[PDB]
């Protein structure tokens, strides 16, 4: 319960993937094997996308645990004066770095440090077997990342632009001003920011020069592609010098495409074969257009037995909100659980009409999307989600299609329901909570992805200003006047709304979730029918307003900034429901049984349909309108209004926040399995649900080129050392 540290007794759970793996054919297993290898390899790039010291820390930890496993290192550490508690703190820290691919939390963007004396850890590291075998490599790493491993200077505590934040999407001297200037340049050149970073170097005269570096295997040398290499030049944008380069994470992405090529030899069909070819093209040249073509092929691969997606996909941890963090997952379709979601798709087109906006703001043609339940074998990157809506290419979402994915074996881990852990709830609600926490999620997730992220028309204009809608007929339902604002050529959702783009869209989807959860037909699809159907509704709403309070952990008062998109979104919904008044929801600061400050969330079950629905319907309509028209000014005025955290009566949120932090619970670490090629078969390796078990899972993750990866990450970090 201390900030910027991971507790020793932090929860660790193992991903359950054994049964899903057993059903796979030999060809499918080899397919999943190489894709997993490609994912895990690219996942290392997240280290470079997190903090300057992160690649060094991973290299140091990987060197340490290759020579001595957690039990071998224990005997050395304890012989050096460390207590078992202090050694446990180190194991938890290392598992944290592994599970996040960095020394910052993927959920909250806060730094975490080892919970033990630095000089004690030094004796362990410098006296380790890894140090005895490679004293130069180890002493160099400790000299480099040692201080930053423990430093909790205010400017290092959170991720972000400016001087009071850390980011490696940008050089250290970059600000929001620079990021905005870069995005305008990118938009004008029709160049996606997903696989790019921005570096600003001043000259001898103090004049800044901007480098937009794309991620690719290939560097400045001539290649077969012209779509990217024609962009590899110097520019003049508004007096500012710009240069588009590539070759970011080149040797890492080289490892990735090696495995994508091998996986391509086991593709079940031409859709899988061609999507992998485009991914290879994308990761080799640095073309998002190529990744788009791959994504287009990927959507056409419906109901696969082994589902996968890889690349610089989500843009949450970019403080500007346009650059993508690398991720890659490999999962097995769960035919049984995927049934309830396909029943939702079967009635999805109908349910879209129930949404609080006219079809002029809805997509033209309903494309029947793929919604499946998946059992994860591999999810590389900073963290694991519960459900996904992908691809994030909006031009594909409303013209080609999109896939919906629910990670069933991940949901099971999140169902860790303990009575003691349920904070800010009355005794009457705790029992109802545990009973329907699971079912309500499946319902919420189902609406969040399919009808949430999958709904909404975007107004666009091409190189000649003709619209994908009809300006002469379409009317803004909030003003009554014709459409005034829209998206121009090169503009995306992330490019316009930038810093609030992720939270805004997540809030819109979450609102659709609560809204359409009142629909009895939907309650049938998941099958609750009666009193149970009334119960899952209350719990879903109860969880939301509870989540809105818990969200205060992920807000930074000194920076007036939200750090987590989903939690900020849930705080907004709470503020909206609080705005409706009439005693629908109240927050009451109390005193806990332990004698510490506490709080209680009161939600009147009866006023959910009478007060709650008109509150959301009004709010949800204003969201979609501003989103469809790209009204960033109105969008920010609306969203950042509810997102405001003050100590105003009667809630006093700034006071509540101190209580939220005091009684906060750390998110579980998740251990993932490995796949090996013993002989001609693929075997699944499983690990202990612990810190040591998680460490072991990464010690066996790269058995062929482990030491090589450490050297690669080290040299890639050293190359960019001047930036921070």
């Amino acid at each position: 319960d201390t900030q910027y540290i991971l507790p020793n007794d932090i929860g660790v759970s193992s991903l359950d993937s054994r049964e899903a793996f057993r059903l796979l054919s030999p060809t499918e297993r080899l397919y999943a094997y190489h894709l997993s290898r490609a994912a895990w390899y690219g996942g290392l790039a997240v280290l470079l996308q997190t903090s300057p010291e992160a690649p060094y820390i991973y290299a140091l930890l990987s060197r340490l645990f290759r020579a001595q496993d957690p039990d071998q290192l224990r005997q050395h550490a304890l012989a050096e004066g460390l207590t078992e508690e202090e050694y446990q703190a180190f194991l938890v820290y290392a598992a944290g770095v592994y599970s996040n691919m960095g020394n910052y939390k993927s959920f909250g963007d806060t730094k975490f440090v080892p919970n033990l004396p630095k000089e004690k850890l030094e004796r362990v590291i410098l006296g380790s077997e890894a140090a005895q075998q490679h004293p130069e490599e180890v002493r160099g790493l400790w000299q480099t990342c040692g201080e930053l491993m423990f430093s909790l200077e205010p400017r290092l505590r959170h991720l972000g632009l400016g001087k009071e934040g850390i980011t490696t999407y940008f050089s250290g001297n970059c600000t929001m001003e620079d990021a905005k200037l870069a995005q305008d340049f990118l938009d004008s050149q029709n160049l996606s920011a997903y696989n790019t970073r921005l570096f600003k170097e001043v000259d001898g005269c103090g004049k800044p020069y901007y480098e937009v570096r794309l991620a690719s295997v290939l560097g400045s040398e001539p290649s077969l592609d012209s779509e990217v290499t024609s962009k590899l030049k110097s520019y003049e944008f508004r007096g500012s010098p710009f240069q588009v380069t590539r070759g970011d994470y080149a040797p890492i992405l080289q490892k990735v495409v090696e495995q994508l090529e091998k996986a391509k030899a086991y593709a079940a069909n031409s859709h899988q074969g061609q999507m992998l070819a485009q991914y290879i093209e994308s990761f080799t040249q640095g073309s998002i257009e190529a990744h788009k073509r791959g994504s287009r092929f990927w959507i056409q691969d419906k109901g696969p037995i082994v589902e996968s997606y890889i690349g610089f996909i989500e843009s949450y941890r970019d403080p500007f909100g346009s650059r993508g963090e690398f991720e890659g997952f490999v999962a097995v379709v769960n035919k049984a659980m995927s049934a309830k979601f396909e029943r939702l798709v079967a009635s999805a087109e109908q349910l879209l009409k129930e949404l609080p906006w006219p079809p002029t703001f809805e997509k033209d043609k309903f494309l029947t999307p793929d919604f499946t339940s998946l059992d994860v074998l591999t999810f590389a990157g900073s963290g694991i989600p519960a459900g996904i809506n992908i691809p994030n290419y909006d031009d594909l979402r409303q013209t080609e299609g999109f896939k919906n994915v629910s990670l069933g074996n991940v949901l099971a881990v999140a169902y860790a329901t303990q009575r003691e852990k349920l904070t800010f709830l009355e005794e009457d609600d705790k029992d109802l909570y545990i009973l329907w926490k699971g079912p309500s999620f499946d319902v919420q997730v189902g609406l969040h992805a399919l009808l949430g992220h999958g709904s909404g028309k975007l107004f666009v204009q091409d190189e000649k200003g003709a619209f994908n809608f009809d300006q002469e007929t379409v009317i803004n339902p909030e003003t009554g006047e014709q459409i005034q604002s829209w998206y121009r050529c090169g503009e995306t959702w992330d490019s316009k709304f930038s810093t609030i783009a992720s939270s805004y869209e997540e809030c819109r989807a979450e609102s659709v979730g609560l809204y359409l959860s009142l629909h009895p037909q939907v309650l049938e699809i998941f099958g609750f029918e009666g009193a149970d159907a009334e119960d899952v509704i209350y719990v879903n709403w109860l969880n939301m307003v509870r989540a809105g309070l818990l969200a205060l952990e992920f807000y930074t008062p000194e920076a007036f900034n939200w750090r987590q998109a989903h939690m900020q979104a849930r705080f907004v919904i709470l503020r909206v429901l609080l705005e409706a008044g009439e005693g629908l929801v109240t927050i009451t600061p109390t005193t806990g049984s332990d004698g510490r400050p506490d709080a209680r969330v009161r939600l009147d079950r009866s006023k959910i349909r009478s007060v709650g629905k008109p509150a959301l319907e009004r709010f949800l309509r204003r969201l979609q309108v501003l989103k469809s028209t790209g009204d960033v000014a109105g969008g920010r005025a609306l969203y950042e209004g509810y997102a405001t955290v003050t100590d105003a009566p009667p809630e006093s949120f700034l006071t509540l926040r101190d209580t939220v932090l005091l009684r906060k619970e750390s998110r579980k670490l998740i251990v993932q399995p490995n796949t090996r090629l013993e002989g001609s078969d693929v075997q699944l390796l499983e690990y202990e649900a612990s810190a040591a078990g998680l460490i072991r899972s990464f010690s066996e993750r790269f058995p062929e080129d482990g030491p090589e990866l450490e050297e690669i990450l080290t040299q890639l970090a050293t190359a960019d050392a001047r930036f921070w």
């Binding site: 959920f107 989500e314 963290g383 989600p385 519960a386 459900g387 996904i388 809506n389 992908i390 994030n392 997730v445 969040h448 992805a449 992220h453 869209e505 997540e506 989807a509 987590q564 989903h566």
Partner: peptide, 4 residues
């Protein structure tokens, strides 16, 4: 667009 995931869901955490």
């Amino acid at each position: 667009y995931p869901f955490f």
